[PDB]
């Protein structure tokens, strides 16, 4: 009803601010590394946790607003298909795309696409999809979501038959 929308948009705008504040920090050379992690590694870690908990709480916000007569919420309650994640990507926020367990890599020199400037580690740049399927993806989010897309397809294709072989 958003209400919920306003709140979700604001929840994400919040995480873009924690991610911005950690960028400024780490660019001043104030971020401390942990033990046995790089700066860059521990930078990425913070950014991925902010982004994840933003997605998470944006999906939660949507699920509470769904009302008893809501058909998806009824399938869910009955247990017949599908899950929190499903509702959340559809209504709240697709969230972070990822190849090889990291955010979208700089496949172009220091950028993920030529629409960005170089050395841009913002969520937008590295494949946080902000929009739900409902609102539809921007072209950048579209591509990064295909990137994440393919990674899953390839892994499905590697068992079929890597498993029909284990079972034998």
């Amino acid at each position: 009803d958003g209400p919920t929308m306003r709140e979700i948009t604001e929840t994400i705008a919040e995480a873009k601010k924690k991610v911005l504040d950690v960028t400024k920090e780490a660019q001043a050379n104030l971020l401390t590394a942990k033990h046995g992690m790089t700066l860059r590694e521990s930078f990425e870690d913070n950014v991925v946790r902010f982004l994840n908990e933003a997605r998470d709480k944006a999906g939660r916000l949507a699920e509470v607003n769904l009302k008893d007569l809501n058909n998806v919420k009824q399938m869910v309650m009955a247990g017949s298909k599908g899950s929190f994640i499903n509702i959340a990507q559809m209504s709240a926020c697709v969230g972070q795309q990822s190849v090889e367990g990291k955010r979208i890599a700089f496949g172009f020199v220091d950028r993920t696409l030529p629409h960005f400037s170089k050395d841009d580690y913002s969520p937008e740049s590295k494949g946080f999809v902000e929009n739900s399927y409902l609102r539809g993806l921007t072209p950048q989010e579209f591509f990064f979501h295909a990137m994440g897309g393919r990674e899953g397809l390839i892994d499905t294709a590697v068992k079929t038959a890597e498993t029909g072989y284990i079972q034998r």
Binding site: V48, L51, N52, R55, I85, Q89, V94, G95, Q96, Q97, S98, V99, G101, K102, R103, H145, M147, G148, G149, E151, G152
Partner: peptide, 8 residues
Amino acid sequence: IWGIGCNP
């Protein structure tokens, strides 16, 4: 396609 340590 969801977030790191979930789906691609």
